[PDB]
Amino acid sequence: AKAKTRSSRAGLQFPVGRVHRLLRKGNYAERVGAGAPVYLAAVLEYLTAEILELAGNAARDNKKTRIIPRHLQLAVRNDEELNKLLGRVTIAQGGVLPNIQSVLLPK
Amino acid sequence: TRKESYAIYVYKVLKQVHPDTGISSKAMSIMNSFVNDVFERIAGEASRLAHYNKRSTITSREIQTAVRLLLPGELAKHAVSEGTKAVTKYTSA
Amino acid sequence: VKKPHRYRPGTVALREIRRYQKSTELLIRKLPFQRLVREIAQDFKTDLRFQSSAVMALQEASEAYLVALFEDTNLCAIHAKRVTIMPKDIQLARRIRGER
Amino acid sequence: EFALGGRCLAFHGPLMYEAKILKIWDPSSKMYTSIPKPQKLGEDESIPEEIINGKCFFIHYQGWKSSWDEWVGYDRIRAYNEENIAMKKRLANEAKEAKKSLLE
Amino acid sequence: RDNIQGITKPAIRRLARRGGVKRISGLIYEETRGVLKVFLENVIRDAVTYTEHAKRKTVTAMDVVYALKRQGRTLYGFG
Amino acid sequence: LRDNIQGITKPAIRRLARRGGVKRISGLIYEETRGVLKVFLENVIRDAVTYTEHAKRKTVTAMDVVYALKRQGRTLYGFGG
Which residues form a coiled coil (chain D)? Predict the structure, then answer.
């Protein structure tokens, strides 16, 4: 019959076949379960959607139609769980969160 | 030669969440780097788990445990839900 | 009676902090940093060629690390009821970070 | 003394300050000579009538922002000389003692 | 040859400002120079190691990425 | 099992600080120490229980604790390896 993508069968956008091939060639274990690449692609797609949503919100707040690394940095650092996840991750041209200590403020 | 990436899939996800928002090349490069990082982290943790229990096969249970160990709280819960739903849908289909 | 206008000490500093906590571009001059990198890359090997992307990635990582160290130093100095950082603050910050 | 780019001294009340000449005014031709050059009054350059008919000079004061350039006539601007520095010290001390008497 | 002096005090001041620093001592600059030098040695040594093991003469950005990654400082946007 | 974090008595924290090289100690420290220790213990035990459950076991082994500590960047020697 006609070829149908496993992502379509799982209703995903991430390529399950590519994930399975990379898992096989990644020297992680001798055998790979059939339901493994689907699970991994689903988790990756969910995380991608989450951070893309936050970045799009940030870009809109800047009245810009395209997400820039600054938007990504702002979204990641503003989201507590996302910031904790990428604790040791450095984003190029991401800048820093605008934050000034209270005692340095004029009084 | 040709080098593969995640550009098309990330683009489709973006069009799903923000059907009007564009993106720059540096942003999707960062996207691909992040995707690869997460992939390697989860796969390495799953391989470590499989070796821990003296098993030659990596199943979806291993990935579930790895995600529970690597993601904090609500992100882990939601990702577990997504993976379970996708697995059930694919098996039913 | 003519006096020249000038802001008080601590105003331009806050303006600059606001300006640079908003922008993301690199702060170090490209050529001096490249020359320093190439000079350093001589006590491991001689006649080392460099992709530009490596140099810029080095600059990005170095600047990010320096900024984080600066922020930690600022916290350390503030903990000492001060607004001025002196190198002992940097030393304490790197010591607590485990670098020392 | 009075040349394009040359150092010149300019009065201001009980004080004087060193300035640099940039435009020298010729009232007969109604033009000023400038250095980056006989050029008429510009679209924004303008001199008041009481000094546009005299030897006016468009100057920038040293130690002061470029926003404070002034079209000073021949009345206040003097030839840059050591004696002018002596008068500079004279009125500087005058202002010093005036302020000291204001305080003490 | 004193490229460490190529790191002028305006750049250090700018980095401190982005770091949220208001008042800076005069002794700071040389301390930053030294610390930055140490960091650069630590990264560049591993980068050159990777370049040599690949039997190459030109250092690639991916080498720097690996060196940073193995030091606990992950960098994105370069591969 | 309720109110056990009070089990870490003030003399115990005092001894811990003395081994830490602390000479003078404020009185409002001990509860902060208890809270931080609780956070650390929760973080470790969560992953330890995750490992135990993935193995479908009912008792937690020291070796699970070893893996949990390793994954958190705190390697411990002398407990099985």
Answer: none
